[PDB]
Design a protein around this ligand. Structure first.
Ligand SMILES: Nc1ncnc2c1nc(Br)n2[C@@H]1O[C@H](CO)[C@@H](O)[C@H]1O
Ligand SMILES: [Mg+2]
Length: 390
């Protein structure tokens, strides 16, 4: 008769990390990769012998910075001359070249110099997400919903579809990341009447606020605001500068010129930062950090909060701006949704909850998984082909 259909997948193709989910048995499963990670770095590395994608690429970045590509989403669908591109290039260790006013990343790969369009790098990340899903499902996957930022234009959306097509995926639809996070909570399933939803998305490197209106399951983007210079990496930087100063006071040594020591410090700082989201203090223990000196210390959540205090407070400026743009008052927002791992920070949650006069925040779906979750819900809806009964 009719052979069972393969499940369709939802992919959050993120700037720093990507996530894949599948809706089955009335629920979403966020799929872990083979290293047990529920999110996969959006990284691709090139060597003389291999092309590594995800954790394998990110884990070898220290010694191969010129041939490990990340942040391709910041280049996707943009012109080489775009001022965003020109500024971002100064921070990247890999080469970005100009091919007819279109940026390409240029690397050493399998004995040759090779250049790739941003959509080709993103297709490599999408190929890894498809394989992660296929390892769990136990069969080939064809259909996917891929998400993008609400501010992406036509060129950026088409280049994302192109990345999916290069990866061998049939792209069912390109949907906005804030819309997918709202779908994850079933905010489009509450019946008739308008609901105003604010999505608070704090990433590794950028912060996005979106205001959506949902009426009878129909989404309208009312306002977008944010800060391109606010993310998790800025909190890691504050901890790095703090501990560099601490080592100077305690051992009368400046470690800041040994890249390995700084990198080991930053890696430890990011993990201590994550621990501080669940505990009121966290230890930092690095053996032979610099000149054979063991660095065994601690940091309280209160000190970390003081170190990043201005940065956390600045998340409320784009919230106020988005509300003015949407012509809405804070009391008129029905739902608050958290997106991004950095939203697990208790102080970030408290500042936003206090701003909205004590309101509950939707954070029950892991914030680094909500976008893929919503994309998986939509992918299952889009492949339905029910024929009406008489
Ligand atoms: N529990 C957590 N508490 C604080 N921060 C976190 C947590 N989990 C994640 Br994930 N992050 C940060 O989210 C960003 C994602 O690119 C990175 O800056 C991560 O450090
Ligand atoms: Mg995201």
């Amino acid at each position: 008769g009719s052979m069972a259909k393969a499940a369709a997948i939802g992919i959050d193709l993120g700037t720093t990390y990507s996530c894949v989910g599948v809706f089955q048995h009335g629920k979403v499963e966020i799929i872990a990769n083979d290293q047990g990670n529920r999110t996969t770095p959006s990284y691709v590395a090139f060597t003389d012998t291999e092309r590594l994608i995800g954790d394998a690429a990110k884990n070898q970045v220290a010694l191969n910075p010129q041939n490990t590509v990340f942040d391709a989403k910041r280049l996707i669908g943009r012109k080489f001359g775009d001022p965003v591109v020109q500024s971002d290039m100064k921070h990247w260790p890999f080469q970005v070249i100009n091919d007819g006013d279109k940026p390409k990343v240029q690397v050493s790969y399998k004995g040759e110099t090779k250049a790739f369009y941003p959509e080709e790098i993103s297709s490599m990340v999408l190929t890894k997400m498809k394989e992660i899903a296929e390892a769990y499902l136990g069969y080939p996957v064809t259909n996917a919903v891929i998400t993008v930022p609400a501010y992406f234009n036509d060129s950026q959306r088409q280049a994302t579809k192109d990345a999916g097509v290069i990866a061998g995926l049939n792209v069912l639809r390109i949907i906005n990341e804030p819309t997918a996070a709202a779908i994850a909570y079933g905010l489009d399933r509450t019946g008739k009447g308008e609901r105003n939803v604010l999505i608070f998305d704090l990433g590794g490197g950028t912060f996005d606020v979106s205001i959506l209106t949902i009426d009878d399951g129909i989404f309208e983007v009312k306002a977008t605001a944010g800060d391109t210079h606010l993310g998790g990496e800025d909190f890691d930087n504050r901890l790095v500068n703090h501990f560099v100063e601490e080592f100077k006071r305690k051992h009368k040594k400046d470690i800041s010129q040994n890249k390995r020591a700084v990198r080991r410090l930053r890696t430890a700082c990011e993990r201590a930062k994550r621990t501080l989201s669940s505990s009121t203090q966290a230890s930092l223990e690095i053996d032979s950090l610099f000149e054979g000196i063991d660095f065994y210390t601690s940091i309280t959540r209160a000190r970390f909060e003081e170190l990043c205090s201005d940065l956390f407070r600045s998340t409320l400026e784009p919230v106020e701006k988005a509300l003015r743009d949407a012509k809405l008052d804070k009391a008129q927002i029905h739902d608050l949704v958290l997106v991004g791992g950095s939203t697990r920070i208790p102080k970030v949650q408290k500042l936003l909850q206090d701003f909205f006069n004590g309101r509950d925040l939707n954070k029950s779906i892991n914030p680094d998984e909500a976008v893929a979750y919503g994309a998986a819900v939509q992918a299952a809806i889009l492949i339905k082909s029910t024929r009406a009964a008489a």
